[PDB]
Design a protein around this ligand. Structure first.
Ligand SMILES: Cc1cn([C@H]2C[C@H](O)[C@@H](CN=[N+]=[N-])O2)c(=O)[nH]c1=O
Ligand SMILES: Cc1cn([C@H]2C[C@H](O)[C@@H](CN=[N+]=[N-])O2)c(=O)[nH]c1=O
Ligand SMILES: Cc1cn([C@H]2C[C@H](O)[C@@H](CN=[N+]=[N-])O2)c(=O)[nH]c1=O
Ligand SMILES: Cc1cn([C@H]2C[C@H](O)[C@@H](CN=[N+]=[N-])O2)c(=O)[nH]c1=O
Ligand SMILES: Cc1cn([C@H]2C[C@H](O)[C@@H](CN=[N+]=[N-])O2)c(=O)[nH]c1=O
Lengths: 348, 348, 348, 348, 348
């Protein structure tokens, strides 16, 4: 028997929804869920979604608390709905998907993914839950993660990191690297070879290779020589140009990371959602240099170097498609006299 | 196991809360409670109270659906709280009392009136409920209604009319005239002799006496003659004076009713609540005569006659005090040369 | 180029969305849509739906303004979504269907019903629109209305009445009686024989048969005589029993209508939606008789007679099933010694 | 004469309510109080309570700005209401108590604590305000703080820290250590001997003894030897076990403090209120180790050592009651072969 | 053609309003603007103003993204409205001015500043926009900024810093020091000689002279001797007195900056708006010293020293008017025996 007061009971006594018997008095006022604790109302939940307050509350309580793929990954694979769990988008404070299966009676389009309503949707399945590998086999459309081989299914090895309760991390006490599988129209699909973005914070940025350590420690000229990068415009692309009114380049998160420890800047996240390429309106506090749409990607610098050096430098301008986080990312490559002028995630 | 979804199940299937088991999907958006019926949301309750929406929804669902005293009667006797029921105030679209006893978890102060937190409050007991007559006996402060005699207690006979689901009616298939008994600090009270307002509507006003019939039928001068009312200013007080900018008199509901059938007027009910005396901002549409605060009471005309004929007409102005619906109503009485000038419920 | 301001221009100038070009200043405050007219704000739409205010505003602006089936008829036939129109549900002040097709960008699931996302949904096609008869032929699941014959398809004749801008009427200057055709999984259905509710109002109730006239005019005993209805409990079932605390019978709208003209009563419409059977919490103001869930259907009296006279009166109680408005309505039939005791739409 | 505009006046010109003459134009929109400053609206207050916006505003303005006991302390002593002041709960952004005495006409259950309505409630009295010691003597239920001896009243010495405007601190320019007194039913109650939690932040944690300094500086093995703690499971209890998927132990705030300066973690405060024991859903960023209900207490480590070493280690499992912040805190003590396995605040 | 969906389009694809063709689906719910990105609603904007949500959204999108004067400066010059741009107040999350000219059809009092409605208002003009110097010449009231000389107009050199997207900065890639001009009633006004506040953060405070570097590094006694400040009460005025319950002095932001790096304090910004003098309710965490209205100004310490030493020290108390940010700031100067007791921005 689901109820608001039982959802609330579970949150108060178990920290999330955990299937327990019980009820607690709840008051709902506008978009906030409160519970009575010793005479006074204590806030349990502020609805930040476009769902009704008591609905968002139930889905948030019912959020998956195992490590799970980052929303950008699910999105890039075309996931529409999850089987019998909620993937909570901690970057949006909302569910990652509009509807549920077997979670919540207001949002459920089905109780079980085998119901035919679910066949046109890409259902996300979790091989760590009993029975879910088999439901993927029977689903017309789906994405499946597992911790091991599935007999006959050709795997795609996922990123090292996963999200655990909004914290992105490479697991040591828990597994966060999954096999990925995808089906379109009953047909298992070959996933493409791909790079993976590293999901690091500007605040907490830590290098993950010698080349990255070198980039952070060395001066610009010295790194560019040491890694034989002359003619590839890392001065514009990665390090950034703060000399003009429009801020030049600065498209690699490590490059922002470098600049941040000298002087701060403002980054307006004006479409705040998880995604492989992010767009910020950036203002440099030291110089006043700025740029309205500054696209930024967190590639391991090794990977970025590998990507740009693979390029034919003989055309003035061309679209360069690179597979990253399973999606195809377009870059613009501008060349002159066989050297790179600029190379950036193409603004769409 | 109280829940939002179970209360909603009871509403949907039984029309009101009925102790049934079951659940239905509920969504709450601002102040409105919806349920899903075949995939579309159906509005089930709009909160018009100062309570949280889900709390108000439950108390409304749990309203007393038997004929109960009108709220004005309960306020006049000083009722603070009800025993194991909710008296719903249909004039305020809200509960009649702040707290509850054995009704709802967010608003309960106790689960039985015997608890000590209740001793100071005047608790309303309904003799029609097994065991409440005996709870009243052991209650320190309380008001009690019954349908027949209570052994060892002299009764006060109530109004003929009661409220059944917001309809004020004199019961023919059910009993609406109660016995009333009251206790302060352990001591049964003698309730004062009292008149009762008649609780009638302007639109569907019916006379309840030959004098009231004669008043609706006869012309002004005739009536005042037949009942020897020369010098009592019923022209001003009951018939109303619409010849000057400030509307004159018109303090008796029957006199509004008479006027309303010939020509309409606005009654602005600026403190919308149940009360023995109502104040209206009246605009007469035919003449433009108006009055900001026109106090109005629905007394049986004969009772109003009896009251006005029992006053000393020999002082210019004074306060005249009348027990009505068990409360003391002050009237201003204005006289000149031993005839009435005006006489109106005091605007205090 | 769809916009909030253009939809508002269309409302202001054409009364509804009409494809015109133009813009007007719009402000949105909570759930209300305003436009500026000579420097003051004029309210243009109050959202009473679970949709976002601007989304609801647009779907309402885009409502079908031709006579369309009543929502109860469409629900009974299982319509999920409409083709390139919005059926507006005037009893719920909301759209009849969750999603749209070719109507509004925030709610569209497709732009034409031929798209594959639509195949599973029962799509409502309006033969009066060029090309929709042929879209229905190629539709997997669908309901279709037409004004005249469709070649190669046997029709089901609908109710005489349709909804034009929330007014349910039998059309004299326009046609309201449609042909109905239905398809599940590619296969044209034979629609069942059915009665149709009459969709009439308590206030403005008109008879549509000599029996209905005789019922409104004659006294109870006379009528029951003229039509040989001894032993069918029309006293209880149609005329209503107001002598006990629980109101007795009163399940036929014509019987409410008769009572309403002599004395009034409260009908609490606690699930306000369009449905073939309505449940009301009724309080009779003259007697105080009442019933929490009084199920009410507006059947042509003669049709109700025909139904009750076609039952086996020889079992104490059983479920009686009747096709009405294309859906199966369960009735409880209660009998003793071969006469009817009661017979009411099942409270299920 | 109280008014919204005068409350607002005081806040603008005095920083809080200070009894001053004056008014300023105020606008209220939804839950925010604004004032006009030179043409534009400036936000004064966002209602975060379950009270009406203008009510919460007045109570917040009227908040006590002297050092006052922490809400957890008042709660543990059963305080229901304060005499002639508002204790503002800065952890809840709301008043610590539902009602007032002599503060606010919407929330006042009385003007003065001697009114009999107040007798069943534990009224908090402030010996630093004239007359309040005497009101405690006359109150049927109460908690009193003073800065010195009260003749005849046996004191309880309180914690060193108090809250001054939401900042918890041990006063140097002001006194923050009070005597505590409590009355139940007219009878002064012996307060129990008790420990006091230290109220430190994870962010700003500072040790307060050699043992705490040693814990922060030394390695685990070294401290455990230096303070002769073998067999007491500080490895699990205080230091924490991040090696498994469920995070083990970690129940002392200093232990979290230690871990925080190496690698960060997430602590969801999912019942956000002041209390002696706090429950967090914790995710370790380095390892992915997590635990849904991780109870944490800030005891001076000396005190924790004193507590655990006092225990009989010869039973597999037993509840161990310790008085802390005047309340009785239950611990679970799990032992094996005369050494501690675990010891944690019992989850209720 | 303006529209909500086109404003939203520009924000999504350009980071702000940029005049581009296009539309995106938008949902508005209460005070938040959302757009659909791949099935889910992404928040674009939370209305923090007292304007309607979709209005504030448009004005915020249309905010000036060039360096512009700080709101405190515009306010001190009496600016009421801007010509054909929005100055966004990032400290209030709202437009700096109530109305617009040529920006937004809901807020526009005119299309062009020459319309006579604009003549009584001080219109802000931006010499960097074509045609705006000339509109200032024709305006009856106005404030104009330029980057260079305007023929015949006697300039006032502004502060070195400007606001670029909420970041206050002295421009290196962009110009942030403007000429200022003002007209009252058709008459260009002499702007006064003035000091300028430095607009630094407590968090990010950086000295800007040897004297400031000395103040931060030296001990109190040493600086006061080195800069020959005996008798001027910097001990009270600048350094602050935390020894009593009322916190003494502490009126220079650099003085707060000094204290902050030793021990933290709380500063309640209780009128949160940009202004030359700021008022904080300050609580010192170390000592519990506090003060309800502590006025603070960020003058370059050199300037403050220059100001106080200019004073006649022979009167017990006098108002001392100093021009700062073009406005006249009142100080109270309290002297005794020819030495300063206190000197603070006069509380009004
Ligand atoms: C307590 C609470 C939580 N959330 C949701 C969205 C946030 O990303 C996430 C919390 N992240 N962590 N740790 O949960 C919310 O929306 N409102 C609330 O009142
Ligand atoms: C359906 C609904 C009902 N009520 C309450 C208050 C009214 O006095 C009463 C309705 N009166 N009658 N018969 O019920 C409400 O407040 N909101 C709602 O949405
Ligand atoms: C003007 C306005 C209209 N409606 C909708 C729902 C109602 O059924 C219908 C009006 N009925 N008729 N004729 O239109 C709404 O919901 N809010 C509004 O502010
Ligand atoms: C200015 C403002 C303050 N408060 C309340 C709750 C916070 O704990 C406290 C502020 N704490 N400090 N310093 O006051 C609020 O709720 N809304 C508001 O707009
Ligand atoms: C994204 C967003 C922004 N603002 C406004 C007010 C803030 O000062 C400014 C953002 N400052 N920076 N970088 O823009 C807002 O009010 N709501 C919103 O949802």
């Amino acid at each position: 028997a689901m109820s608001l007061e039982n959802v609330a009971f579970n949150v108060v006594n178990k920290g999330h929804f955990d299937g327990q018997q019980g009820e607690v008095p709840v008051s709902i006022i506008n978009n906030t869920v409160y519970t009575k604790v010793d005479g006074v109302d204590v806030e349990l939940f502020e609805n930040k979604t476009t769902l009704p307050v008591n609905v968002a509350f139930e889905l948030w309580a019912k959020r998956n608390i195992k490590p799970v793929p980052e929303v950008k990954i699910l999105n890039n694979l075309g996931v529409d709905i999850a089987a019998n769990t909620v993937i909570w988008d901690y970057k949006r404070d909302a569910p990652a998907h509009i509807s549920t299966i077997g979670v919540c009676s207001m949002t459920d389009i089905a109780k079980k993914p085998t119901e035919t309503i679910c066949a046109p949707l890409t259902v996300f399945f979790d091989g760590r839950v009993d029975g879910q590998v088999d439901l993927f086999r029977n689903a017309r459309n789906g994405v499946l993660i597992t911790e091991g081989s599935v007999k006959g299914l050709q795997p795609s090895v996922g990123p090292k990191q996963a999200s655990l309760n909004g914290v992105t991390l490479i697991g040591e006490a828990v597994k966060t690297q999954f096999n990925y599988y995808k089906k379109v129209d009953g047909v298992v699909q070959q996933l493409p070879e791909t790079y993976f973005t590293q999901s690091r914070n500007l605040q907490e940025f830590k290098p993950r290779s010698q080349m990255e350590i070198d980039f952070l420690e060395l001066a610009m000229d010295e790194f560019i020589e040491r890694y034989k990068l002359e003619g590839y415009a890392f001065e514009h692309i990665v390090y950034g140009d703060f000399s003009h009114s429009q801020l030049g380049g600065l498209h690699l998160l490590i490059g922002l990371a470098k600049r941040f420890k000298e002087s701060p800047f403002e980054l307006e996240d004006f479409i705040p959602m998880d995604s492989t390429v992010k767009n910020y309106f950036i203002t440099d506090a030291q110089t006043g240099s700025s740029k309205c749409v500054c696209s930024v990607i967190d590639l391991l610098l090794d990977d970025f170097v590998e990507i740009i050096k693979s390029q034919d430098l003989s055309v003035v301008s061309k679209v360069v498609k690179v597979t990253i986080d399973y999606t195809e990312i377009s870059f613009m490559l501008w060349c002159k006299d066989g050297h790179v002028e600029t190379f950036y995630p193409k603004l769409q």
